[PDB]
Amino acid sequence: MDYNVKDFGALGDGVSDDRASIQAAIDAAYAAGGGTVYLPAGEYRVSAAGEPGDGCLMLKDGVYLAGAGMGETVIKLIDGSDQKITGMVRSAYGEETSNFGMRDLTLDGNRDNTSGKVDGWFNGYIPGGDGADRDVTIERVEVREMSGYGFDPHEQTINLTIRDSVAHDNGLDGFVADYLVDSVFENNVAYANDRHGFNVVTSTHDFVMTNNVAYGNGSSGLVVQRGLEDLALPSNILIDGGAYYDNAREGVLLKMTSDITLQNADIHGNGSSGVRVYGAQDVQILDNQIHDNAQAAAVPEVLLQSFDDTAGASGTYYTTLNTRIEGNTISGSANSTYGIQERNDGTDYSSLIDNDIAGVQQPIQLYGPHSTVSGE
Numbered sequence: 001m002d003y004n005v006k007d008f009g010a011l012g013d014g015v016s017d018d019r020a021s022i023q024a025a026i027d028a029a030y031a032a033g034g035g036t037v038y039l040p041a042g043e044y045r046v047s048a049a050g051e052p053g054d055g056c057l058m059l060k061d062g063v064y065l066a067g068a069g070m071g072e073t074v075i076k077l078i079d080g081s082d083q084k085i086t087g088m089v090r091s092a093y094g095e096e097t098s099n100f101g102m103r104d105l106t107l108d109g110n111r112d113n114t115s116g117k118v119d120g121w122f123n124g125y126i127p128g129g130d131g132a133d134r135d136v137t138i139e140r141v142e143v144r145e146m147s148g149y150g151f152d153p154h155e156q157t158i159n160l161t162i163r164d165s166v167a168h169d170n171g172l173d174g175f176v177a178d179y180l181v182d183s184v185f186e187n188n189v190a191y192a193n194d195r196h197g198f199n200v201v202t203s204t205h206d207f208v209m210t211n212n213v214a215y216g217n218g219s220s221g222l223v224v225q226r227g228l229e230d231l232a233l234p235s236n237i238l239i240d241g242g243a244y245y246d247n248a249r250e251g252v253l254l255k256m257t258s259d260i261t262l263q264n265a266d267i268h269g270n271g272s273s274g275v276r277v278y279g280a281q282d283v284q285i286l287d288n289q290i291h292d293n294a295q296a297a298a299v300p301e302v303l304l305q306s307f308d309d310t311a312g313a314s315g316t317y318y319t320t321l322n323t324r325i326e327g328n329t330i331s332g333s334a335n336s337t338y339g340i341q342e343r344n345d346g347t348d349y350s351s352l353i354d355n356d357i358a359g360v361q362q363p364i365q366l367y368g369p370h371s372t373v374s375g376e
């Protein structure tokens with residue numbers, strides 16, 4: 001069944017710690033076998049619910065949080081908080097939670113008046129363990145001011161859906177896709193984040209990102225990477241549509257990964273390259289709008305190169321191979337060295353087909369003994 005948090009003591013006066021109250025309603029709904037815990041408009045302050053892994057509010061199978069809409073319902077940490085909080089709203093560790101989520105609300109990590117690494121949303125089973133959370137759903141949710149991550153769906157979630165949401169002004173990445181499977185990010189916006197807008201890491205595969213926008217972030221707009229550990233490379237991922245622009249680093253970074261498809265996206269005004277492939281295999285850059293990047297350095301619009309990790313976790317030398325770059329409209333900025341460029345670092349088997357390279361110190365520059373062009 002469904003409930004109203006104020007029916008459990010929750011005031012929402014921007015001062016009173018409404019944690020236990022809210023959590024009660026969640027428990028009630030959990031007991032009833034499911035349900036939508038509601039919170040009317042207003043500001044609900046919450047304190048840490050113990051240790052970092054306990055977060056603030058906890059969700060269990062069949063429970064969802066709903067508010068008066070973004071900007072209307074706001075769950076804000078209490079001025080003065082000071083401890084690592086791995087998820088202001090989360091699912092239990094080691095507990096395979098299914099059927100839960102939230103919609104139409106704003107989580108404010110309130111980092112200006114607090115200390116400790118606070119992440120907005122966190123869910124998952126066991127990092128490095130067998131099992132996962134399932135069928136999660138976040139909709140029209142805003143996560144801002146966290147000192148850490150904005151949205152942190154963690155290892156491992158299956159069939160996750162984050163749509164029409166906004167992460168901004170957080171300490172790290174706006175949205176993280178840490179080991180997600182058969183999931184979807186759709187029509188989301190990450191901006192003003194201290195690092196990446198979108199960070200796809202730790203073995204994520206069969207994942208689709210449709211119409212997402214990342215701009216004004218501290219590092220790259222969207223990044224797909226292996227991760228600090230020698231885990232499986234994220235793979236078979238689709239980035240369809242959207243725009244990644246005016247970010248400090250690249251628009252899109254693909255580091256140590258494979259079977260990635262970037263298409264129909266608008267990539268501009270980024271500090272470094274628009275799209276940078278860093279030691280990835282079978283990546284496809286199709287029909288994208290890559291223009292006016294390299295705002296902070298003399299780099300190419302599209303950069304292809306290999307990643308040496310022979311001295312890192314893997315001891316492997318990631319060679320970028322089989323990169324298909326087709327039907328793109330590449331246009332440079334004053335500082336754009338090339339439209340497309342390979343580093344002579346072993347990168348091979350690049351396929352340049354039907355590209356409109358314009359306004360750059362030079363269109364194409366290939367090195368691999370097998371890299372080819374077909375009409376340009």
Ligand SMILES: [Ca+2]
Pocket residue numbers: 091092093094095096097098123124125132133
């Ligand atoms: Ca769980």
Ligand SMILES: [Ca+2]
Pocket residue numbers: 127128
């Ligand atoms: Ca580990």
Ligand SMILES: [Ca+2]
Pocket residue numbers: 169
């Ligand atoms: Ca700020």
